[PDB]
Amino acid sequence: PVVKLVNLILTDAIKRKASDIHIEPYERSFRVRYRIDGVLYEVMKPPLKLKNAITSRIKIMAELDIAERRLPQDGRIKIKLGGGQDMDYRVSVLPTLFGEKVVLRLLDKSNLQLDMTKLGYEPDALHYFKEAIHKPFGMVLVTGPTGSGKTVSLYSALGELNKTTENISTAEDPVEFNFAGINQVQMHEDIGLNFAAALRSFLRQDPDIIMIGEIRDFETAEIAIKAALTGHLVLSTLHTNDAPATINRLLNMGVEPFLVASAVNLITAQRLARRVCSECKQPEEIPIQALIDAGVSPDEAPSYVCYKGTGCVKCNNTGYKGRVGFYQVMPMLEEIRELILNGANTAEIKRESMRLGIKTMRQSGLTKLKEGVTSFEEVLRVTVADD
Amino acid sequence: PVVKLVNLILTDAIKRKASDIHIEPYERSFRVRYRIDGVLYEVMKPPLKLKNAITSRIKIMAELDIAERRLPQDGRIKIKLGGGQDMDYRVSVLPTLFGEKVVLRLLDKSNLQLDMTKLGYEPDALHYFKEAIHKPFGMVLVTGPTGSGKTVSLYSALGELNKTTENISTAEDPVEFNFAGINQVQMHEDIGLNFAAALRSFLRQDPDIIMIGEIRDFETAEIAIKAALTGHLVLSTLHTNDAPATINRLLNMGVEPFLVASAVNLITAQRLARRVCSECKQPEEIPIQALIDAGVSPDEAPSYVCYKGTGCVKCNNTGYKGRVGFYQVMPMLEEIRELILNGANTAEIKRESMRLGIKTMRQSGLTKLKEGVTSFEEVLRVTVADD
Amino acid sequence: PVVKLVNLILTDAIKRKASDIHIEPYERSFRVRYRIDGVLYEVMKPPLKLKNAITSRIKIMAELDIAERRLPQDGRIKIKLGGGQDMDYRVSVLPTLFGEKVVLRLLDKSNLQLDMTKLGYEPDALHYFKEAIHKPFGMVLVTGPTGSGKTVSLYSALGELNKTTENISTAEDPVEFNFAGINQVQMHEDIGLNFAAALRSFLRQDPDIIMIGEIRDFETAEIAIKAALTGHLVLSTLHTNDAPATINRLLNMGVEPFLVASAVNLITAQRLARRVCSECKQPEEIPIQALIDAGVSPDEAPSYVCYKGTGCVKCNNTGYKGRVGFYQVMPMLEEIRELILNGANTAEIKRESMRLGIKTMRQSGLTKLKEGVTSFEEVLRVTVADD
């Protein structure tokens, strides 16, 4: 009955066509609630009676951590039919006093679209990104938090590059989207297939462009560096606040700055914020000083028309519907490289990139605010200030 | 024999409407003190020789190990007093050289009052609080020291707001009563779940109603006020003297003024003062001007029949029996928002709330004096004059 | 002869009013030294055959391990030779290269006055100190070395606060005197009871007034600040050169100015300086300019009447006998608070404090010089000039 019970619990939430799934255990109750169009409904009460006797066994059956019931966890679930027309869930686990509560929010690979022109890049930034992904070598780091649009931007680059003249092979943990003509390896760390082993196999597979799901340790980073310096364009990912903090993250990991300065051609940082609801969007009164204090460049300010959804069902009573990406696309220009040779810190890199005209994710969010697709509060929710 | 005596001690604290029990060893003495209506009284001087065995006994009731008498310990005790009559205790024991000091904190909503009109909210304050907690988004802040009835007031607000349609998440320090259906996280710094990380998980847990235990740094504050503006109901606390001093805490840490002004609907501050004992209360010829100087309106002064209990056993020969809440309930009125955007200080905001009719906590207490419910000295003891 | 000699070593210290006894064996000598008013004098050169015998004898007096003579040992002795408290001694055995040196620390509360008005406070300073110990919350720091009457000042405050209405918790390493009603904790770090654990534990003990033995880091400093800010009266110590540099020290430590301004009510610094002996006291024609150089404002200069002891047996032929306390009391004035909030350093706080009437220990000593109880040179010896 335990095998059936675990199968029932996992299957029912998926089965009932819920827009958000809330699984909440308590001291005396254990409930499932569906958020449908911004509103929660209690949808199921599993029994308290079988919780403790068959505890560890089910936790092993659902491939969950049987020993940990105390800390938050965050992930992604991409479910494809083979390819990219994949329905996916953003999964968040939270430790309540009587067990872990999980919240699942639905999204799609294509509703958040893979056209690099549709990703929100400024013309210089879009130029640098397209120019960067079409180079024969170097490192491109797409940075941002979880749920920030990273997989779409990298895949947008892969689509831009997927041509019959080049051999594309990717190593992902896991593979988010399938591409015919691209040799995609999903990491199977258990059998020894991790990012390092897959990169080395790619390196034994006569590769031209190598994609690694993530730079996890300095050794894998170093192998990626090797692949980049031997003549391959290597693209990978880190979870950081912005592009320069990714620099400081690798420097803090122990990589010499000059390797950072030499191997990386472009670092982008990004985000997903909610787009104002087109049904209830209204212009919103926001003081000019708060927008200036939040990071907007002086020339875009007077033009801003900030919209806010009053909150309807298509925005989950949030006033926002869909997502918008806010980007800071900083190229590793040769002067910046010289600065590394002159020992500049990451903060100096940030100062110089702003000096070079690179708008931050905050300024790009304020740009989205300017076009009236997001609100200033969304800009503040998803990005940090440039001040 | 001694165990039974201990049971009597714990029953008597409840019977005497004590809020705290203190089992106190000294170098050469041992005494038991109850905090009754917020004030401690020496109630027992047990022999020092038996105290540690008694302490050892408490650990069995807490399912704690009697063997360890050398480390600080903290826990809970559930005692089954018959039927639904069960009693939770937050217990902290500390082993000094000459014995263990034990502190007991009663955990029973039965002892608590839950009707918000019965909490001490003035009709203006109750009205403004209800108006604040029933808005679809924004922040409501309840200030006062620990044990000032903040937990009772918030428990009443969440109960007002406790719907299946909302994802309610609370971060608490500590939990004083358990509600099924509310996602309650208790802080545990040793494993990494703090206010900032928990707040970000709440923003990722599809929240509707958010309660944050305490504000530690600027990061968590900015996240919470922006979560309020995003379309979440956010509750939190500060130890301030009034709502404006809480404001100024927020201003000095760096939250942009429009965020505070626009995401905060309302701020309450609240104290507890003892009620004049109904048995021994006698009119106290408190000069009416002293009442006015303390914050009584001029018209109500001569009407005041100020009472003080001369003292009887019902009030522990103190003249006071029970407590009452003094509330200053200041909604984040737009004029208050204009002041936030203009950088106003604590006194100006408090002055405007009073100008707008927000009774301060001192004035609320003197009104309680007018009703003969509390004495002038208790109002004076827990509130400062409005001056 | 060795037992009688040892008794002479312990008793002549009583007749000599010594603070410490040092019994030191050497290769070519053997001596007994008394500490009188902070200065050591040789009082006996007992026979070197008894070098180890006298010091080994004290172990026997201390109920210490005679079999071990190679390792440092520490114990306690209770001797009944008088005073106000028993002649208790803390014994420390050190195996030097020429025998065991034993040091005995004389313990007697009556060696210091516990009345606050007899601790040497000036009336305005005593008033501000009492006002400070009676506010419901905040932090007050008393700086000075141990034995400068700091613990007695604290104990005097505790006696003023030792009511059955307050929960008093102290963390001391160790507890010098015990007070009924005051919950005192001796630190025992071998079992996990350090200063940090005891503060956080007091905070779990429902405290009202909290005493801490020592501030050891920023982390503990933060817990302390928030305890003084969360409705507790917090008293603790550090040894710093003055109040303004203690300010700059904490600012350098990392505490936020607003928490500093909100939690600190008052900072005192205190030393015990030697009092000129009245018998050999003679007026000393100290030039007025030396006093102005020492720090008195020039308009007060001509009025100073400097005194000095010519030396007699009561003063060890030093001209001084006993101690008076030199206090410098900087209340956390609003002017001083505003200095905090603008990141002020030691110098401008010092300038403001002299502008605002904050007396230095040097100004208080010159006042005692004017009063003729201490001399200018002891002041110049143990204090540095202001002006």
Author numbering:
A (entry chain B), B (entry chain A), C (entry chain F): 182 to 568
Relevant lines from the article:
PilT is the PilT/VirB11-like ATPase that powers T4aP depolymerisation. Adjacent packing units adopt one of two conformations: open (O) or closed (C).
To determine whether this homogeneity was observed in a Proteobacteria PilB, we performed cryoEM analysis of PilB from G. metallireducens (PilBGm) in the absence of nucleotide. It should be noted that the N-terminal domain of PilBGm, known as the N1D, MshEN, or GSPII domain, was not observed in the 3D map although its presence was confirmed by trypsin digest followed by mass spectrometry (98% coverage from the His tag to the C terminus). Thus, cryoEM analysis reveals that PilB preferentially adopts the CCOCCO conformation in multiple species. This is in contrast to PilTGm and PilTPa that both adopt OOCOOC and OCOCOC conformations in similar conditions. We also showed by cryoEM analysis, in accordance with the recently determined PilBTt structure, that PilBGm uniquely adopts the CCOCCO conformation in a noncrystalline state.
